[PDB]
Write an enzyme that holds these catalytic residues in place. Structure first.
Site, PDB file in Angstrom:
ATOM      1  N   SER A  28       0.771  -1.236   0.000  1.00  0.00           N
ATOM      2  CA  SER A  28       0.000   0.000   0.000  1.00  0.00           C
ATOM      3  C   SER A  28       0.810   1.297   0.000  1.00  0.00           C
ATOM      4  CB  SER A  28      -0.966  -0.009   1.182  1.00  0.00           C
ATOM      5  OG  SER A  28      -1.933  -1.032   1.040  1.00  0.00           O
ATOM      6  N   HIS A  34      -6.412  -0.865   6.710  1.00  0.00           N
ATOM      7  CA  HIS A  34      -5.846  -2.203   6.887  1.00  0.00           C
ATOM      8  C   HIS A  34      -5.831  -2.655   8.347  1.00  0.00           C
ATOM      9  CE1 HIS A  34      -4.834  -2.958   2.715  1.00  0.00           C
ATOM     10  NE2 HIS A  34      -4.466  -1.677   2.618  1.00  0.00           N
TER      11      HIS A  34
END
Ligand SMILES: CC(C)(COP(=O)(O)OP(=O)(O)O)[C@@H](O)C(=O)NCCC(N)=O
Ligand SMILES: CC(C)(COP(=O)(O)OP(=O)(O)O)[C@@H](O)C(=O)NCCC(N)=O
Lengths: 445, 446, 456, 440
Positions: free
Chosen positions: D287, D373
């Site tokens: 990410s 997340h």
């Protein structure tokens, strides 16, 4: 009067030869043929077409002579080969040109499939005769066998998830055993049953040929046991599926006879069942014997002063029917009454079974086996495996073949040579049970 | 060496005659062996030799033919019943069918047979076009394979699939690749070619749907188009097709995907089927034509420019006044360059005679009396009218080179297609517009 | 008894408020346990008690509510910033959402949840209609489940599937089974009902396509139909629908397949969506109506034919001239006479009687639909349904349904609810907001006739 | 003149209470809102709607008092429960009535999804302010979360057999990394790659949320290694697929934020990969860190650097520390000066560790991707130096990419711990960098 005038303007002339490589003429023929109501009318039209529009026997004879003229001097591959092609051309009948064009029109192939069925029906009804109809037949058959050759047929499976149009068509053109209600058709395609058909890759969901399969424990010796069952509905358990039994096998389109449609459907359905059930190795049919009664009744004659019954057998029969043997039996064997008289049933077990064995095995039409169903399964390399007493108690069954059904078994690794032996040498492979009945019969005729 | 062995155990043997309508069992096996082997052969020259071996050894049985011919003759000397004569005629007809037909027929039934047979034909046409296999036997075998392939790829055996932006990428990639008349520029372009005012179709075999055989691109318009750029280089306002402003349908690209099927089919059904298809969406749509190229034109001109009249004195005096040099050395150079287009002075002067010259090339120039130009033949065959010749129709480098920027209009008149086809095929007659006839008449002077 | 236990470990707990827009992980597990258990309960009375247990123990937290209310009040005494007041108002709004909403919401996400929740509602309505669960808590819980189910069965969540003869048999068997207005006779009949001049549709949830929720049968015609037999007992010449001879569309059967979804939806889209669907095939098609039954009619008549007797033979429902006539036909009194032959389905056999009974029965029926109310919303359920959607109570039909089922339920009368595409919106508002019924002159006339001679 | 005049005739009045159980009024609103071109105009309209059509604070206060009036005498479950429902009703804002009706109209839910996206954009642009817009937001969000809960979303897979419309939409609203040509999109969905999306069961082939997966050997520490690969095309061999790497995860419809669309896409995508590859147990993301540069630059205003570190920097930039770095750290030029790169390795990595771990917005982790997340129970597993060399990458987060790992049998409690207790689970590498930073 009329009929002829059309034929002459619809059927295009045979091009010279060169310019061999009439579109709006075809529609004139199809439009007219459709316009005729009676089959008798379609017979005269197909008859006149077949007669006046065949080969030119003059040119065939001329080109034939021209080939022999060339083999006396043996000149070039080139010039001999054209003399052969000129002959190949003269041999192409004039009506082939009509069919070839029609096929490339819209409702084309559908119309030709139909037309042939009209011709097949007129042939069997003795409305059309001679050798010019027999030729036109083969021509149509050849043309049809190239458009319907295995490679172009999709194998479709019928289930309760299938369209209603399909179930209706499968039950309607069901040309063996009638189904009594929707309540039944659900069972027929339901668990422990397989209903497969063939459709052209152009027209899917349109059945050409239909096959019915019973997933069973052992080789079935009765049709009522299959048709009138109530298969558990406890979803298929693979453990008890040991035999695949072919019980209905019928053409939906009569136009497609002798195009081996049946043969390939069995072949293809096997490779399917083999895939689904890898522990399945017993493949057999439970087939009827149509024409057996008609054969037996016919044989109950006469001035061939032909003994089909032993001393012991004749005396027992007459002391159950009130009169002589031939006249009494001839009467009741065509009326399905004889079944409810259990004395006459047990009496007629042994001789019928023995004569039946002979009817399939011994009786020949050009050396191939009179019974067309027998010819069918044998062509395929099947074994005339077992004769079954009172296996079909239904009306058509009793009056059709005195309740006798026959088992044609398919031993997968020996179908290929059995086909060759049957077609090439005219040999029938039969089991010890059948051979014994034939043996019994050999004691008296 | 071993090539010979396979052939003798793979080409199924001719059955008896009585067993002629029944497939023998080993036929399935014998064929797969042939497919397996031919498949195994990598370099084409081997495939070419094997095809030669097949045509030679597995054609008509010449002995059986001559015998049955005497058969039919020996019976006509003693006027026997039709019953008998027809029987003897039929055995001769069967004895005339070559052995390789059985191979082809039995291969068709196989798991990938028809595909295989197409690829086999492609090789046979290549093997000939590379003088790798000469002879009447290969010629005989070619014609038999074409005929078989003609019945398996006849209208009623083909699907009419439409390509849109909703179609999978896989499909769009196949159409881009198989694009044969005007190569697709970019993706933003491909979207335009299947969008508003444009229709894209293909025919697939029913058995292998999704695998295209022929791609037809159609431009929905207000008149009969005369410029290719005016089609491809147009971005409409994206506004969903105004149904009312659609007068005619134009066919700007036609691509045959498989070289194996070269002139097996006819062509009409590629068109008249797309026509009915369109008509369903646009009932009041009635004008139909193609906007076709003229490949082989510029070469035909240069080929002739080696001496001849062709031009007037007034045109000869003019071209040279523009260029500076002779004429028959001048034209030769700038025409075989694709640079002449840059001079507008020259573009204008060259117009009258080139149009005149082109009008002959299509209508007057023949090959066995059937029109020299392949594109012309194709549309003429189907019953199209040689409707209109177009000046500076294709200004791309490809267009200028191949046909000095000229494009013909082959107009399909739904109604007269049948008679027009007959006229063209039977009598070798070309139906042409007043615009075309005028130019031919002008050519007929010099 | 162990019923209590499952509830305390299966109904997910109310999250903090800060964690309010985020699903906790054990919610998936906790729900499946509730679905597993409720599924396991065989006899309904157990399901009814468990529902009672849920509504009582897992509603609004009454403590947290009263607290946050004081919260909002204690701040308005000291005029704090909107920033603060809105925050305190929101916690009170969240504190007011009952705990069982979380259960229902978290069950919806499950592998068969929405189906399950429908079946759960059906039980809650049954448990009430059998006085198995009384109380404002079950009433609260019912209203919360309906509201949730109203958002999941809202046009945009349903497919419009068409049944034809090309449809699978499985599908045709489902439609035959779920047939609620006029039972399908035989298979040869089912083919006719999905054939030329007949259209058959159903709505399925997008998530479970193929599983029908509502079956609509349509008869394509030349006029507004007035006889049910004239539809079902017709075999056309099978010739593909002459498009030209189709003036109107008639709705002769409407079946709700799942009892869990009783009146969550509206109805309007069911009709108007099939309408646009039809219109695509028949652009110049413009007339629309239903041919509905009148269930509960004959019973309502017999019910009154008891309590509404009167002096010297006569009574409130008939004229003297009609009273004198019926009795002259039958042979007996009238209020003992009618009572018998009407609750028999045998009166139809006497043509003499069929004719005389006409004028008054039509008059009586016209009241029953238009005048007779239940909480001012039309007593007749079928009437309510079409009225809700904006349909006009268009026409009352005599001897419309001569089947044994028709004669019994509504003395062979069938009403025509006519949908005017254009006026459906206002007509719906009028009916729902103001409890107003738009009726034809043919209907209004008969009501006026009833009013002239019937205090009831 | 207008704007207000419409609102008053379009938004239905609040029914008394009783008659709580205007169809042709909604179409008047949707028709008008569509008619406005500028976002600035849609902002004033949504702003005025939110302001003048909220709750009636009067009735809310009144019904609140009426509940406390009843708890002093504790009367029946029945009568107390109605006093609570009367309060529940007064709390229902007036515009909820407008939305509720709109939703039951044709292009309804589609219009509301769109409207909220118009509001979210106007909020972030500071066109609309206050607490009345924040309330209207939550209302729309609540309404959307019930029509878009997991149960109604079909998981669709993108391949080269997919429609062109789908590939285009996937590349167009691709809100992370640009694709260079069709030649590339074939590779992106090709072998060793998985592209999954969510569509509503009503509207299939219409992507709401899009996820990209790299079927790999080990946990990827670079994006250029994935984007700019030439995956063999020798069809997938299961033997070398040991790690599933999430590389692009983006919303196509901004209207659907905070509706947990993201989480459920991963949850469902996992169960899919687990089914296809039973020997696959390594699940992680690769990410970005959006807002890191903006945080760092902001913080250079005006010690995040040791003595040794500052002297080294300035003897590479020609002037003071704060003004020099502020200038070049926002212009992506600093990468081609390898002296300044190696110099900025250790401090950036350490400050970055802190940015994700230590910095908090309501105690949850400022970085919205970090919150995402972690909410899911992922572990902030590894920080990767110069993992994103692209323009947006460099200026977005100074080339830094972070690895959020998913350990399947501990996602559930990690979600609870993170949400309930505000705890972040981090690997020894991350904890070490946070430890380094603690000396400042
Ligand atoms: C199979 C039937 C329908 C015809 O098949 P057909 O396709 O004509 O065979 P063929 O002659 O084309 O090889 C028929 O001849 C037959 O054998 N029917 C009954 C067989 C059975 N019930 O086992
Ligand atoms: C997934 C994104 C686009 C937003 O998703 P969203 O649907 O708002 O998540 P949720 O808050 O609704 O659960 C975003 O927050 C994010 O995490 N982006 C980058 C993540 C990555 N590239 O791995």
């Amino acid at each position: 009067g009329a009929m002829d005038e059309l034929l002459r303007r619809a059927v295009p002339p045979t091009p010279a030869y060169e310019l061999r490589e009439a579109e709006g003429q075809c529609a004139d023929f199809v439009s007219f043929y459709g316009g005729l109501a009676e089959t008798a009318q379609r017979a005269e039209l197909l008859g006149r077409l077949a007669r006046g529009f065949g080969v030119d026997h003059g040119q065939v004879a001329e080109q034939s002579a021209g080939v022999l003229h060339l083999r006396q001097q043996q000149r070039e591959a080139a010039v001999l080969l054209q003399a052969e092609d000129r002959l190949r051309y003269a041999l192409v009948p004039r009506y082939r040109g009509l069919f070839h064009h029609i096929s490339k029109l819209d409702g084309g192939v559908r119309f030709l499939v139909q037309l042939r069925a009209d011709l097949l029906e007129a042939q069997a009804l003795k409305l059309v005769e001679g050798p010019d109809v027999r030729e036109m037949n083969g021509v149509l058959k050849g043309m049809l066998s190239e458009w319907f050759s295995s490679g172009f047929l999709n194998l479709e499976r019928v289930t309760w998830h299938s369209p209603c149009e399909v179930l209706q068509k499968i039950s309607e053109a069901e040309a063996v055993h009638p189904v009594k209600n929707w309540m039944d058709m659900k069972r027929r395609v339901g668990p422990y049953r397989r209903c497969y058909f063939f459709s052209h890759c152009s027209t899917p969901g349109e059945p050409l040929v239909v096959l019915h399969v019973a997933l069973t424990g052992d080789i079935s010796s009765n049709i009522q046991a299959i048709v009138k069952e109530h298969p558990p509905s406890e979803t298929e358990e693979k453990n008890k599926i040991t035999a695949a039994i072919f019980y209905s096998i019928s053409l939906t389109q009569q136009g497609l006879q002798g195009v081996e449609l049946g043969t390939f459907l069995i072949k293809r359905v096997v490779k399917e069942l083999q895939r689904e059930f890898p522990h399945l190795g017993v493949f057999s049919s439970l087939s009827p014997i149509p024409g057996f009664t008609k054969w037996l009744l016919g044989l109950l004659n006469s001035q061939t002063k032909n003994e089909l019954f032993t001393d012991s057998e004749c005396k027992e029969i007459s002391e159950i029917t009130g009169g002589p043997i031939n006249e009494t039996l001839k009467l009741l064997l065509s009326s399905s009454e004889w079944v409810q008289s259990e004395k006459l049933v047990r009496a007629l077990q042994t001789p019928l079974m023995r004569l039946c064995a002979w009817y399939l095995y011994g009786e020949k039409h050009r050396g191939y086996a009179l019974n067309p169903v027998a010819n069918f399964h044998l062509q395929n390399g099947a074994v005339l495996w077992r004769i079954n007493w009172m296996a079909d108690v239904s009306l058509r069954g009793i009056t059709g073949s005195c309740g006798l059904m026959a088992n044609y078994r398919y031993f997968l690794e020996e179908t290929g040579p059995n086909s060759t032996s049957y077609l090439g040498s005219k040999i029938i492979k039969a089991s010890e049970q059948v051979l014994s009945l034939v043996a019994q019969f050999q004691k008296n005729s």
